[PDB]
Coordinates of C-alpha atoms and ligand atoms in Angstrom, one line a residue:
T1 CA -8.9 -12.1 -97.5
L2 CA -7.3 -15.3 -96.3
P3 CA -6.6 -15.9 -91.9
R4 CA -3.8 -15.5 -89.8
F5 CA -1.1 -17.6 -91.0
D6 CA 0.8 -20.4 -88.1
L7 CA 1.1 -24.3 -88.5
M8 CA 0.0 -25.1 -84.8
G9 CA -3.5 -25.2 -84.7
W10 CA -4.1 -27.1 -88.5
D11 CA -7.8 -28.2 -89.0
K12 CA -7.5 -31.8 -89.4
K13 CA -8.6 -32.2 -92.5
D14 CA -5.8 -30.2 -93.7
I15 CA -3.0 -31.5 -91.7
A16 CA -4.3 -34.0 -94.4
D17 CA -4.1 -32.0 -96.9
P18 CA -2.3 -28.8 -97.0
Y19 CA -0.9 -28.2 -100.6
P20 CA -3.4 -26.3 -101.1
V21 CA -4.0 -24.8 -98.2
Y22 CA -0.4 -23.1 -99.3
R23 CA -1.3 -22.9 -103.0
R24 CA -4.2 -19.7 -101.4
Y25 CA -1.7 -17.9 -99.4
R26 CA 1.1 -18.7 -102.1
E27 CA -0.6 -17.5 -105.2
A28 CA -1.9 -15.0 -102.6
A29 CA 1.5 -13.2 -101.8
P30 CA 4.8 -14.9 -101.4
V31 CA 5.4 -14.1 -97.9
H32 CA 3.5 -13.9 -95.5
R33 CA 3.4 -11.6 -92.2
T34 CA 1.7 -13.1 -88.7
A35 CA 2.3 -10.2 -86.1
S36 CA 3.1 -10.8 -82.0
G37 CA 2.1 -8.3 -79.9
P38 CA 3.8 -5.3 -79.6
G39 CA 6.2 -7.3 -77.5
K40 CA 6.7 -9.1 -80.4
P41 CA 9.2 -11.0 -81.7
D42 CA 6.9 -11.4 -85.8
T43 CA 7.0 -13.7 -88.1
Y44 CA 7.1 -14.2 -92.0
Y45 CA 5.8 -17.1 -93.6
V46 CA 8.3 -18.1 -96.9
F47 CA 6.0 -20.2 -99.6
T48 CA 7.9 -19.1 -103.7
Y49 CA 11.2 -21.5 -103.6
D50 CA 13.3 -18.3 -104.5
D51 CA 12.4 -16.9 -101.1
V52 CA 13.5 -19.9 -99.3
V53 CA 16.3 -20.6 -101.3
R54 CA 16.6 -17.1 -101.1
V55 CA 15.7 -18.0 -96.7
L56 CA 18.6 -20.9 -96.4
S57 CA 21.1 -19.6 -97.9
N58 CA 21.4 -16.1 -96.6
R59 CA 23.7 -16.5 -93.2
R60 CA 22.1 -13.0 -92.0
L61 CA 19.7 -15.9 -91.1
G62 CA 20.7 -18.0 -87.8
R63 CA 18.8 -20.6 -85.7
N64 CA 18.2 -19.5 -82.9
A65 CA 16.9 -16.2 -81.3
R66 CA 20.6 -14.1 -80.7
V67 CA 18.3 -11.2 -78.4
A68 CA 17.4 -8.8 -81.2
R69 CA 15.5 -31.6 -67.5
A70 CA 17.3 -34.5 -69.0
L71 CA 15.1 -33.6 -71.8
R72 CA 16.6 -30.3 -71.6
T73 CA 20.3 -31.7 -71.4
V74 CA 19.8 -34.6 -74.5
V75 CA 18.8 -32.0 -76.6
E76 CA 21.3 -28.9 -75.5
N77 CA 23.8 -30.5 -78.1
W78 CA 21.3 -32.4 -81.1
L79 CA 23.6 -30.6 -84.4
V80 CA 20.3 -29.4 -85.9
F81 CA 19.8 -26.0 -83.4
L82 CA 23.6 -25.2 -83.3
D83 CA 24.6 -22.4 -85.4
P84 CA 27.5 -21.7 -87.0
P85 CA 30.0 -21.9 -84.4
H86 CA 28.8 -25.3 -82.4
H87 CA 27.5 -25.7 -85.3
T88 CA 30.7 -25.5 -87.6
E89 CA 32.4 -28.2 -84.7
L90 CA 29.9 -30.9 -84.7
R91 CA 28.9 -30.3 -88.1
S92 CA 32.7 -32.2 -89.4
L93 CA 33.0 -34.4 -86.4
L94 CA 30.3 -37.1 -87.8
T95 CA 29.8 -36.0 -91.4
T96 CA 31.7 -38.3 -93.1
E97 CA 30.3 -41.1 -90.4
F98 CA 27.4 -40.2 -92.6
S99 CA 29.2 -40.6 -96.8
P100 CA 28.3 -42.9 -99.4
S101 CA 30.6 -45.0 -99.1
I102 CA 29.3 -45.7 -95.1
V103 CA 25.4 -45.8 -96.6
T104 CA 26.5 -48.0 -99.7
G105 CA 28.0 -51.0 -97.7
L106 CA 25.0 -50.5 -95.3
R107 CA 22.0 -51.4 -98.0
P108 CA 22.2 -55.4 -97.9
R109 CA 21.5 -55.1 -94.3
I110 CA 19.5 -52.2 -94.7
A111 CA 17.6 -54.9 -97.1
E112 CA 17.1 -57.8 -95.1
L113 CA 15.4 -55.8 -91.9
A114 CA 13.2 -54.5 -95.2
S115 CA 12.0 -57.6 -96.0
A116 CA 12.5 -59.3 -92.4
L117 CA 9.9 -56.5 -90.6
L118 CA 8.0 -57.2 -94.1
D119 CA 7.7 -61.0 -93.3
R120 CA 5.8 -60.1 -89.7
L121 CA 3.6 -58.1 -91.8
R122 CA 2.0 -60.2 -93.9
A123 CA 1.6 -62.4 -90.3
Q124 CA -1.7 -59.9 -90.0
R125 CA -6.0 -59.4 -91.5
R126 CA -5.7 -55.1 -91.4
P127 CA -1.5 -53.9 -91.3
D128 CA -0.5 -51.1 -89.9
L129 CA 2.4 -49.3 -92.4
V130 CA 3.2 -46.6 -89.9
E131 CA 4.0 -49.0 -86.6
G132 CA 4.8 -52.1 -88.1
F133 CA 7.8 -51.3 -90.9
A134 CA 7.9 -47.2 -92.0
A135 CA 8.3 -46.8 -87.7
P136 CA 10.6 -50.0 -86.7
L137 CA 13.2 -49.7 -90.3
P138 CA 14.5 -46.4 -89.8
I139 CA 15.4 -47.4 -86.3
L140 CA 16.7 -50.4 -86.8
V141 CA 18.6 -49.2 -89.0
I142 CA 20.2 -47.0 -87.4
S143 CA 20.4 -49.1 -83.9
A144 CA 23.0 -51.5 -86.5
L145 CA 25.0 -47.8 -87.1
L146 CA 25.3 -47.5 -83.0
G147 CA 25.4 -50.9 -82.6
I148 CA 22.5 -51.4 -80.7
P149 CA 21.0 -54.1 -80.0
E150 CA 18.5 -55.6 -82.5
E151 CA 16.0 -56.2 -80.3
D152 CA 15.6 -52.9 -78.4
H153 CA 13.5 -51.2 -81.8
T154 CA 10.5 -51.6 -80.1
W155 CA 11.4 -50.0 -76.6
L156 CA 13.3 -47.6 -78.4
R157 CA 10.4 -45.4 -80.4
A158 CA 8.0 -46.0 -78.2
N159 CA 10.2 -43.5 -76.5
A160 CA 11.4 -41.9 -79.9
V161 CA 7.7 -41.6 -79.6
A162 CA 7.0 -40.1 -75.8
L163 CA 10.4 -37.7 -76.9
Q164 CA 7.5 -36.1 -79.7
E165 CA 5.5 -35.2 -76.5
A166 CA 7.6 -32.3 -75.9
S167 CA 8.4 -31.0 -79.7
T168 CA 7.7 -27.5 -80.3
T169 CA 5.4 -28.6 -83.2
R170 CA 2.8 -30.1 -81.6
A171 CA 0.7 -29.7 -77.8
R172 CA 1.3 -33.1 -69.5
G173 CA 3.8 -34.1 -72.6
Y174 CA 6.7 -32.8 -71.8
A175 CA 6.3 -35.8 -68.6
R176 CA 6.7 -38.2 -71.1
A177 CA 9.0 -36.5 -73.0
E178 CA 11.1 -36.1 -69.7
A179 CA 10.8 -39.9 -68.8
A180 CA 11.8 -40.9 -72.5
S181 CA 14.8 -38.9 -71.9
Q182 CA 16.6 -40.3 -69.0
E183 CA 15.2 -43.4 -70.3
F184 CA 17.6 -42.8 -73.2
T185 CA 20.4 -41.3 -71.9
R186 CA 20.2 -43.4 -68.6
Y187 CA 20.1 -46.2 -71.7
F188 CA 23.0 -45.5 -73.6
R189 CA 25.2 -44.1 -70.9
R190 CA 25.0 -47.5 -69.9
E191 CA 25.9 -48.8 -73.4
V192 CA 29.1 -46.0 -73.6
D193 CA 30.4 -48.6 -70.6
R194 CA 30.5 -51.7 -72.8
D195 CA 30.0 -49.6 -84.1
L196 CA 29.6 -45.8 -84.1
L197 CA 29.2 -45.5 -80.8
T198 CA 33.0 -47.4 -80.7
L199 CA 34.1 -44.3 -83.2
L200 CA 32.8 -41.3 -81.0
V201 CA 33.5 -42.8 -77.5
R202 CA 36.7 -44.2 -79.5
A203 CA 37.9 -41.0 -79.9
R204 CA 37.4 -39.5 -76.7
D205 CA 39.9 -42.6 -75.5
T206 CA 42.2 -41.2 -77.5
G207 CA 42.2 -37.5 -76.3
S208 CA 39.4 -36.0 -79.1
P209 CA 36.8 -33.3 -76.1
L210 CA 33.8 -35.6 -75.7
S211 CA 31.6 -35.1 -73.1
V212 CA 29.9 -38.3 -73.1
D213 CA 26.5 -36.5 -72.1
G214 CA 27.3 -34.8 -75.8
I215 CA 27.5 -39.3 -76.8
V216 CA 24.6 -39.7 -75.6
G217 CA 23.0 -36.8 -77.4
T218 CA 24.3 -37.6 -79.9
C219 CA 22.8 -40.9 -80.1
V220 CA 19.8 -39.8 -78.5
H221 CA 19.6 -37.0 -82.3
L222 CA 21.1 -40.0 -84.7
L223 CA 18.1 -42.6 -83.4
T224 CA 15.5 -40.2 -83.5
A225 CA 15.5 -39.1 -86.5
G226 CA 14.5 -40.9 -89.0
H227 CA 12.0 -41.7 -87.2
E228 CA 10.7 -38.2 -87.2
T229 CA 11.2 -38.2 -91.4
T230 CA 12.1 -41.8 -93.0
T231 CA 9.8 -42.1 -91.3
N232 CA 6.3 -40.0 -92.6
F233 CA 8.5 -40.1 -96.0
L234 CA 7.2 -44.2 -96.4
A235 CA 4.0 -43.8 -95.3
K236 CA 2.9 -40.5 -97.2
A237 CA 5.3 -42.3 -100.2
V238 CA 2.6 -45.3 -100.4
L239 CA -0.1 -43.0 -99.7
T240 CA 1.1 -40.6 -103.5
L241 CA 1.0 -43.9 -104.7
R242 CA -2.1 -45.4 -104.1
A243 CA -3.2 -42.2 -105.5
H244 CA -1.4 -41.7 -108.6
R245 CA -1.5 -46.6 -109.7
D246 CA -0.1 -45.3 -112.8
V247 CA 3.4 -44.7 -111.3
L248 CA 2.8 -47.0 -108.6
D249 CA 2.3 -49.4 -111.2
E250 CA 5.2 -48.5 -113.2
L251 CA 6.9 -48.6 -110.5
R252 CA 6.3 -52.3 -109.8
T253 CA 7.1 -53.3 -113.2
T254 CA 10.2 -51.1 -113.2
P255 CA 12.8 -51.5 -110.0
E256 CA 15.4 -50.0 -111.7
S257 CA 13.4 -46.9 -111.2
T258 CA 12.8 -46.6 -108.0
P259 CA 15.7 -43.9 -106.8
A260 CA 14.0 -41.3 -109.8
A261 CA 11.1 -42.5 -107.9
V262 CA 11.7 -41.1 -104.8
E263 CA 12.9 -38.5 -105.1
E264 CA 9.9 -37.0 -106.9
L265 CA 7.9 -38.5 -103.9
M266 CA 10.2 -36.9 -102.0
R267 CA 9.2 -33.1 -104.4
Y268 CA 5.9 -34.3 -103.9
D269 CA 5.0 -34.5 -100.1
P270 CA 7.9 -34.3 -97.9
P271 CA 8.3 -35.7 -94.1
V272 CA 9.2 -32.1 -93.0
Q273 CA 7.0 -29.2 -94.4
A274 CA 8.8 -26.0 -92.8
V275 CA 12.6 -24.7 -90.9
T276 CA 12.6 -21.6 -89.2
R277 CA 15.1 -19.3 -89.2
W278 CA 15.9 -15.6 -86.8
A279 CA 17.0 -11.9 -89.4
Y280 CA 20.2 -11.8 -87.5
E281 CA 19.5 -8.5 -89.7
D282 CA 17.1 -6.1 -91.6
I283 CA 16.4 -8.0 -94.4
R284 CA 13.8 -7.7 -97.8
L285 CA 12.2 -11.0 -99.4
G286 CA 8.6 -10.4 -101.3
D287 CA 7.2 -6.9 -100.9
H288 CA 8.0 -7.5 -97.1
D289 CA 10.4 -5.4 -95.1
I290 CA 11.6 -7.4 -92.8
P291 CA 12.9 -6.5 -89.4
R292 CA 16.5 -7.6 -87.6
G293 CA 14.4 -10.1 -84.7
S294 CA 12.0 -11.3 -87.1
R295 CA 11.5 -15.0 -87.2
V296 CA 11.4 -16.6 -91.2
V297 CA 9.6 -19.4 -91.6
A298 CA 10.9 -22.2 -95.3
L299 CA 7.6 -23.6 -96.6
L300 CA 9.8 -27.3 -97.9
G301 CA 6.5 -28.6 -98.9
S302 CA 4.6 -25.3 -99.8
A303 CA 8.2 -24.1 -102.3
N304 CA 8.5 -27.7 -103.2
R305 CA 4.9 -27.1 -105.5
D306 CA 5.8 -23.8 -106.5
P307 CA 4.6 -23.8 -110.5
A308 CA 7.2 -21.4 -110.7
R309 CA 10.3 -23.9 -110.3
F310 CA 7.8 -26.9 -110.8
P311 CA 5.6 -26.7 -113.9
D312 CA 2.3 -28.4 -113.2
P313 CA 3.7 -29.0 -109.4
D314 CA 0.2 -31.6 -108.6
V315 CA 1.3 -34.2 -111.2
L316 CA 3.8 -37.1 -109.5
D317 CA 6.0 -36.6 -112.1
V318 CA 9.3 -39.2 -112.0
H319 CA 11.1 -37.4 -115.2
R320 CA 11.4 -33.8 -113.7
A321 CA 14.6 -33.0 -113.1
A322 CA 16.3 -34.2 -110.4
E323 CA 18.2 -32.1 -107.7
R324 CA 16.1 -29.5 -107.5
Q325 CA 14.2 -29.9 -104.3
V326 CA 14.2 -28.7 -101.3
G327 CA 13.2 -31.1 -98.9
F328 CA 16.4 -31.7 -97.1
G329 CA 17.0 -28.2 -96.8
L330 CA 19.7 -26.7 -99.0
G331 CA 23.2 -24.9 -98.1
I332 CA 24.9 -25.5 -93.9
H333 CA 22.4 -27.4 -93.0
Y334 CA 21.8 -29.2 -95.3
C335 CA 20.2 -32.9 -93.8
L336 CA 23.2 -34.8 -92.1
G337 CA 21.8 -38.4 -93.1
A338 CA 20.2 -37.3 -96.4
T339 CA 22.6 -40.1 -97.6
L340 CA 21.3 -42.0 -95.7
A341 CA 17.4 -41.7 -95.9
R342 CA 17.5 -41.4 -99.4
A343 CA 18.9 -45.8 -99.2
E344 CA 16.3 -46.3 -96.6
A345 CA 13.8 -44.5 -99.0
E346 CA 14.5 -46.6 -101.7
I347 CA 15.1 -50.0 -99.6
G348 CA 11.8 -50.0 -98.2
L349 CA 9.6 -48.5 -101.0
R350 CA 11.1 -51.4 -103.2
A351 CA 10.9 -53.7 -100.4
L352 CA 7.1 -52.1 -99.8
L353 CA 6.9 -52.7 -103.7
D354 CA 8.2 -56.0 -104.2
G355 CA 6.9 -57.4 -101.1
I356 CA 2.9 -56.2 -100.7
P357 CA 1.5 -57.7 -104.1
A358 CA -2.2 -55.2 -103.1
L359 CA -0.6 -52.7 -102.1
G360 CA -2.5 -50.5 -104.3
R361 CA -5.3 -52.3 -104.4
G362 CA -8.8 -52.4 -101.7
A363 CA -9.4 -48.9 -98.6
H364 CA -6.7 -48.2 -96.4
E365 CA -7.2 -46.4 -92.9
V366 CA -4.6 -43.2 -92.1
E367 CA -5.4 -40.7 -89.5
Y368 CA -2.2 -37.9 -89.5
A369 CA -0.2 -37.0 -86.7
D370 CA -1.3 -33.2 -85.5
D371 CA 2.3 -31.5 -86.7
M372 CA 2.4 -29.3 -89.5
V373 CA 6.4 -29.2 -89.9
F374 CA 7.0 -33.1 -88.6
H375 CA 4.4 -34.5 -91.2
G376 CA 2.6 -37.6 -91.2
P377 CA 0.3 -40.8 -91.1
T378 CA 0.8 -41.9 -86.8
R379 CA -1.1 -45.1 -88.7
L380 CA -1.8 -46.7 -92.2
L381 CA -4.5 -49.2 -91.7
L382 CA -4.3 -51.4 -95.8
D383 CA -6.8 -53.6 -96.1
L384 CA -4.8 -56.9 -97.5
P385 CA -5.2 -59.0 -100.1
Ligands
HEM401 C1 13.9 -37.7 -95.6 C2 14.4 -38.4 -94.6 C3 14.5 -37.2 -94.2 C4 14.1 -35.6 -94.5 C5 13.2 -35.2 -95.3 C6 14.8 -34.9 -93.1 C7 15.0 -33.2 -93.8 C8 16.2 -32.2 -93.0 C9 15.9 -30.5 -92.9 C10 14.8 -29.7 -94.6 C11 17.4 -29.5 -92.1 C12 17.7 -28.4 -91.8 C13 17.0 -27.5 -91.3 C14 17.1 -26.8 -91.1 O1 17.1 -26.0 -91.8 O2 17.7 -26.0 -90.1 C15 17.8 -31.2 -92.1 C16 18.9 -31.1 -91.2 C17 18.7 -32.8 -90.6 N1 19.0 -33.7 -90.3 FE1 17.2 -34.5 -91.6 N2 16.3 -35.1 -93.5 C18 15.3 -36.0 -93.3 C19 16.4 -37.8 -92.3 C20 17.3 -37.6 -91.4 C21 18.5 -38.0 -91.0 C22 17.9 -39.9 -91.0 C23 19.2 -37.9 -90.2 C24 19.9 -38.8 -89.3 C25 21.1 -39.7 -89.9 C26 18.9 -37.1 -90.5 C27 20.0 -35.7 -89.3 C28 19.4 -33.7 -90.0 C29 20.4 -33.7 -89.1 C30 21.7 -33.3 -88.1 C31 20.4 -31.8 -89.2 C32 21.0 -31.1 -89.2 C33 22.5 -30.7 -89.7 C34 23.0 -29.6 -89.9 O3 22.8 -28.1 -89.0 O4 23.9 -29.3 -90.1 N3 18.1 -35.6 -90.9 N4 17.5 -32.8 -92.5

């Protein structure tokens, strides 16, 4: 027997290494039911690659529970929380502002920022890679995309961190989050009244239906999006490579391999460990007949280590075929900043490899956040030289 599954209330040691946990449940059964009341609604956890793909592509499974606070206003038009209707119009909106075209031209600036961060990082005995590089890099890149002042990166990040307090994937948390939400709102509303902001504002100045609240809420999502994902990718990437010195060393000596490495590092330990859905109709999955209204949880980290799809899943193999891992999702809700995130991943990782020769040497001090959805270290100390 195994205890009832749930992503909340995980032992700190399992948070550090969840994969063996996924494996035992996955070997037991592809889908696991974790009952409610009665009063319900019941939840179903999907551990298999194929079933996760089924979950993510089924139109009958939507994002919000559809019955069988400057924070509330900031979070209310975040694209990651909208279903197809509201969702379709908004996604189409900012989609091409994150095109390979814009990202490609942004890469040189991303590298410049990564380099600058390292320069400072190099000036301390035992640096924190999270607070000193992984966390500030996404903030700084998106800030340059929004035309925000570079020097605000530290303040903005502090608030992004505060905002996380109220996350449903975590545990007076709302106080800090509301404080932050109000701080962001006041901040961005002042910005609207004077470059992605320009375009979003300009859209309203020339007839495009956009509320100042919508532009503001949008800015807060984009500003905090990479901080809760890319940051975690980079920090865990350092942990993975230190644990796999053969790959770390090959990467140092084969720069052109960075892209494939990032794809495999993403498969191996993805930043977002799960995405939730709600059944709008009865569904069958695994051996389960899932009633309309049940909550369905797609375990991306579990899917990415599914031996049925990835042979020897625990081996870090940069030679696997690309475009299979589901770390950026799959379907209509496929990560919007996937292109931008991938560029920050490759550029930031290369910066670290070329910037910290002893990255793979010595011991490290790591502490993970009590979060099994946005998964990663809250701090990663490194013994340098
Ligand atoms: C490497 C880091 C990242 C990972 C692993 C990641 C992963 C994901 C996943 C799995 C989803 C699917 C959610 C669902 O099924 O409902 C998603 C959605 C989304 N992501 Fe990311 N993401 C990353 C970075 C970013 C960044 C940097 C931005 C901002 C520019 C961003 C913006 C979004 C948006 C707007 C959605 C919702 C899109 C929709 O519903 O159509 N992501 N992401």
